[PDB]
């Protein structure tokens with residue numbers, strides 16, 4: 062490891078057109094000093110591999126403001142208006158990549174694995190290709206995504222994804238020792254850790270340099286072999302994107318709450334599912350940005366920029382919580398270790414296809430495709446029954462882009478609960494009291510079985 | 523996590539024929555109490571996925587003695603004569619699996635990845651098929667391995683490997699908290715960590731159970747989500763397989779000059795490791811160990827000996843300041859990714875274009891390849907062979923084509939013997955660059971099984987000071 066005092070000296074040899082991996086999830090664990098140094102060098106035409114686009118004026122957004130980025134590879138690019146303008150104008154190329162795929166592709170690039178198979182994205186636009194990566198200024202398509210190859214293993218379909226490597230990685234960490242060993246704080250680890258292993262030249266900024274021996278050797282998150290250049294960051298702003306401090310929907314929330322079992326591991330999406338946790342039993346909440354054991358929103362003095370949920374909100378953790386990297390988080394999710402994934406949806410098909418990431422009128426799929434990728438995890442959709450004008454949301458075939466094929470196991474609406482089977486279809490198992498089966502029939506765009514043991518829809522006390 | 527007070531209760535439902543992942547590297551980080559519990563249940567016809575099989579009379583070796591294992595999936599037999607015997611005799615099935623492949627296939631099994639590509643094993647019996655899985659009584663092959671698919675990426679050839687999962691995993695860890703989070707000590711982590719993630723039911727034995735809060739949340743090695751059953755081990759013997767307590771010299775003193783300041787190196791048993799003793803205090807070289815250590819130091823004094831800290835040769839070792847520990851999947855990610863600068867190792871044969879044979883002699887040496895196929899798998903890592911020039915009877919070790927099974931094709935960059943140093947080009951062959959003083963080129967021609975170029979700048983063989 063070579064130590065630098067001046068962040069610019071550490072990045073001055075990045076050539077124009079370089080591929081650069083940039084750590085962070087939202088504004089959590091972003092290499093703000095190294096980004097600042099690139100603003101000074103003015104290096105341009107970059108391909109940035111970055112999970113998100115920061116915000117307009119921070120993180121990766123700063124490099125968009127200066128027009129130093131040509132292309133991005135990312136999983137979710139919302140909350141950045143500059144990004145949107147450039148992309149729509151044909152000034153920016155963008156490959157939206159499932160978050161778990163992004164993490165594993167980066168890992169593969171550090172591990173000597175050129176390609177691997179994953180369930181994530183099978184049956185979606187990721188597999189099919191053809192999505193706009195770049196527009197022209199007149200609104201025509203300049204560059205479209207390529208398909209992914211499909212192969213069956215053990216009776217299930219998977220797609221082939223290839224390793225990502227960079228010329229450089231810009232990584233944020235918490236502490237380094239004088240040998241160059243590095244550690245990460247709370248949920249700021251995320252993509253920083255795997256990105257440390259996947260570039261020709263890795264540049265790490267830390268908040269503090271400590272004596273050799275300050276770490277237990279077992280608790281070094283990134284060994285020095287991966288840390289080519291190290292700089293102590295001059296300034297840390299501790300910016301917080303979303304400061305979070307402590308009837309149709311309530312009906313859904315109060316039924317969704319009854320899906321929780323004692324000892325359960327769950328991942329809860331933004332909105333109704335997370336609100337359902339307030340009504341919970343020991344239930345361990347997982348966060349795809351690398352947390353197990355999420356707790357309630359903080360009191361003001363518990364607020365910490367290094368600890369957010371997947372919705373980018375400030376959060377807390379409970380006793381016996383753990384933190385881990387984005388590649389590890391999605392290994393946990395893709396391997397079916399989470400018992401229950403609960404999420405919102407725009408549409409669900411008769412056999413359990415899910416559309417919940419794109420409305421043709423673009424932000425990216427985030428971790429949604431990974432979350433529904435394993436048959437071992439129960440996937441429960443919580444949504445209002447029908448859209449505007451009693452337009453069907455549950456129907457024969459989705460009309461909106463798929464998150465996953467045949468992946469939903471249960472649907473909870475304000476009117477009904479359905480069990481879903483890939484081969485057998487839908488079964489109505491609960492019915493909001495007062496409603497009839499014919500009411501459900503009129504608000505549902507496909508047939509369903511009615512359970513002999515049908516009951517009024519349950520509500521958490 | 524479900525907690526148990528009796529190890530047998532934790533494992534009573536393993537059925538005959540089950541596939542069981544078993545933690546450990548030699549005798550380091552082995553689940554000795556869970557192995558004891560299986561001795562009591564008598565479960566049989568197992569397929570045991572484990573790097574090694576302990577020693578004859580400890581670790582997984584105990585389950586070979588009791589004939590409870592049908593097939594081993596392993597990287598190296600090591601110093602277990604009974605393992606070696608049962609395999610050669612046709613009593614035991616063994617899939618000799620490159621150690622980094624083993625580790626990655628297990629990781630894949632926990633991570634939702636059914637298959638992936640690796641260069642490890644390309645151009646060898648692993649890729650080609652024909653690795654003996656079961657022998658006949660007469661030494662012919664009853665069951666041969668099947669070929670692995672080959673695919674080219676980025677101008678290099680790779681092979682397809684498939685995920686490994688178990689019905690059960692038997693894992694040794696150091697501490698668990700009352701929530702079921704688990705940590706590992708020193709180099710006892712090895713395969714235990716990825717095996718935790720890759721079975722239908724994971725059973726972890728620990729030395730201590732501690733309060734929730736005993737761990738920093740950043741420093742939990744295996745989060746509780748992976749730990750289905752937890753027991754505190756009743757007995758820990760802290761056994762040590764190999765107590766190492768603090769012309770060949772010519773090879774060692776030349777090999778010592780391969781070291782550069784700042785270098786990361788992986789040094790094989792024997793000559794390469796002995797060369798590290800001649801590294802100047804003015805130079806910084808960091809030694810990596812494939813069982814999950816970075817920063818190996820000298821052999822320990824008695825009071826420094828620790829059963830949780832051994833090198834790849836299974837010798838008790840120490841570490842230097844600023845060392846780190848990591849799992850076997852991470853260790854081989856480090857190696858296959860080309861992060862190590864120098865791999866130095868011995869060989870039985872090397873071809874003129876850099877093919878290496880160092881793992882098998884049909885009907886004689888059948889212990890496995892360990893991590894050697896992985897260690898020579900990256901074009902970013904320099905590979906130096908250190909070996910005696912000729913074999914018994916002046917039989918050639920350097921030749922046009924190896925006669926023994928390959929560890930790797932066109933992977934060696936330099937050969938150091940007591941007589942010569944050769945640079946190796948995969949297209950142009952060998953160039954004699956140094957010659958031991960007193961020897962002539964004809965001396966080399968007589969003791970070498972192929973032709974070679976002689977450098978215009980040939981110098982006498984150098985020796986470290």
Ligand SMILES: [Cl-]
Pocket residue numbers: 573574597598600834892893
């Ligand atoms: Cl070994």
